[PDB]
Design a protein around this ligand. Structure first.
Ligand SMILES: [Zn+2]
Ligand SMILES: [Zn+2]
Lengths: 233, 233
C-alpha cells in the first residue's frame, strides 16, 4: 500500500492544462474522448493523443510526467499495475519495461520510473514547445492492459495524472483524465454517457445500503424486478 | 430566491475561528454543542455562548456578523425567516426587530440588517478584544424559532455563518456551525450522535436502480431498516 498522489487540477504560473481531440463514437473507433465524463476510451495498446497547453513557455529542463492511480477511494493506495499474463509474456517488445501500464509513444527521450519510496510507476519526457504555427504540444500514450484484465486493473476505473514539473521534480502544473481500455470505445462511451444522461434526468438512481448482507437482499430483489421488466417487454 | 453566501472556513490573517463550551447531554440541558457534528443544540430563545478566537488583534472598526442559511442544497436560496406566528405576535418585546431569527444578547451596539439586494437577515456587533486574563471574546446569541416551526424553518436544518470583517464590510475571516432549536437538546444531541456513530461504523454498497417510483420504494425500505437499527438499542 502506498501514499496517494494529489489529483488536484492546478494550472500554475504557465497556465497548464490538457486538451483532447474531438472524435466520433462509431463502433469502429479505436480511441475516443468523452468531454462530458472527462474520460478517454481506447483499445489495448492503441495510440492516445493528448494535447499540452500553456500560456507561457516554461524554463529549460521542464518535464511532463504521466502516472495512473485507481479512481475508487478503497483502491487508491494500490499501485496500478499490468496483469501478470501481459507482464511476463515471453514476447515483450522491449520498447519499454514490461511492468509499465502507461507508455509514451514516439519519444526516445522517454524515461520510465519505478519510485523507490512509493513503488508507483510513471513515465516522463522533456517538455517541448509547440511546433511552429501551433499553440499546443502533443504527447502520445499507449495503455498495455485492458481495464478488465484479471490480476491487473480488474475492471477498476483508473485516473491518469499529468504533471508539469521542473528538472528537480518540483510541481509546476497538474491535470488529469479518466481512462478505460476496452474492446469497443465507441459504444462504451455512448453507454456511459447515456448512463450519466439518465441519472441527470431522473431515470436512474443510486442508493446506499449499509451492510453486505442487507445490500445483497436489495440487489437480488432489484434483479428479479429487472428480469420481470425483460419478461414484460 | 437569493444568492447563497459562502460557508468556506477561512481563518484569515488574524487566525479567526470559533470555540464552544463543552457541555453534557442530560435531558435537562438548555444548550449543548456537539463537536462530532459541529452542531449546536438549544431550546427556544435560550442563550447560546460562542467564543471568538484570534491569534493577533484585528484593527479598530472590525466587526463580527452572524447570518443563517439552510443547509440542504435545494433550500439554500430561500432566506431563513421566523414563522409568521412568532413574527407577527402582538406581544413582541422590541429588543430586536421581530423578523430576525438570530439575535445577539447583552450588546446595545448590536445592529440588525435586512440586506437591500439579497433580503437576507444578519446581526452585527463591534469586535472587542478578550477581557484581561483571557484569550477569547464571548458573543451570546438567541434563536427565536424552533427548527420545526411550520411556516418557518419547517424542520429544515440551518447553518450559522460568523464572519469577521472590517468597517467597510470586507472579509477578514469566516467560520460556521449547524444549529437545531428544539425542546430537548440533550436527547437530540445523543440521538444524532448515535446516528452518526452507526453511519461511520457501517460499510456501504451502491445499488443502481431504474425507475423513480422503484427507487422511492427501495429508499423507503432502506430508511425503514435503518430506523429499526436505531430502535433496537
Ligand atoms: Zn493485462
Ligand atoms: Zn416560529
Amino acid at each position: 500500500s502506498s501514499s496517494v498522489p494529489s489529483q488536484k487540477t492546478y494550472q500554475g504560473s504557465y497556465g497548464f492544462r490538457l486538451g483532447f481531440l474531438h472524435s466520433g463514437t462509431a463502433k469502429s473507433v479505436t480511441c475516443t474522448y468523452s468531454p462530458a465524463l472527462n474520460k478517454m476510451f481506447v483499445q489495448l495498446a492503441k495510440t492516445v493523443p493528448v494535447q499540452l497547453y500553456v500560456d507561457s513557455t516554461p524554463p529549460p529542463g521542464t518535464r511532463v510526467r504521466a502516472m495512473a492511480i485507481y479512481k475508487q477511494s478503497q483502491h487508491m493506495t494500490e499501485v496500478v499495475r499490468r496483469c501478470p499474463h501481459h507482464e511476463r509474456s515471453s514476447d515483450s517488445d522491449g520498447l519499454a519495461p514490461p511492468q509499465h501500464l502507461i507508455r509514451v509513444e514516439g519519444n526516445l527521450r522517454a524515461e520510465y520510473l519505478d519510485d523507490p519510496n512509493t513503488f508507483r510507476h510513471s513515465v516522463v519526457v522533456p517538455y517541448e514547445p509547440p511546433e511552429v504555427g501551433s499553440d499546443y504540444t502533443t504527447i502520445y500514450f499507449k495503455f498495455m492492459c485492458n481495464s478488465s484484465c484479471m490480476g491487473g486493473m480488474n475492471r477498476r476505473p483508473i485516473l491518469v495524472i499529468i504533471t508539469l514539473e521542473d528538472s528537480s521534480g518540483n510541481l509546476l502544473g497538474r491535470d488529469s483524465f479518466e481512462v478505460r481500455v476496452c474492446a469497443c470505445p465507441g459504444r462504451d462511451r455512448r453507454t456511459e454517457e447515456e448512463n450519466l444522461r439518465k441519472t441527470m434526468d431522473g431515470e436512474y438512481f443510486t442508493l446506499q445500503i449499509r451492510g453486505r448482507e442487507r445490500f445483497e437482499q436489495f440487489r437480488e430483489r432489484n434483479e428479479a424486478l429487472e428480469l420481470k421488466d425483460a419478461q414484460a417487454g
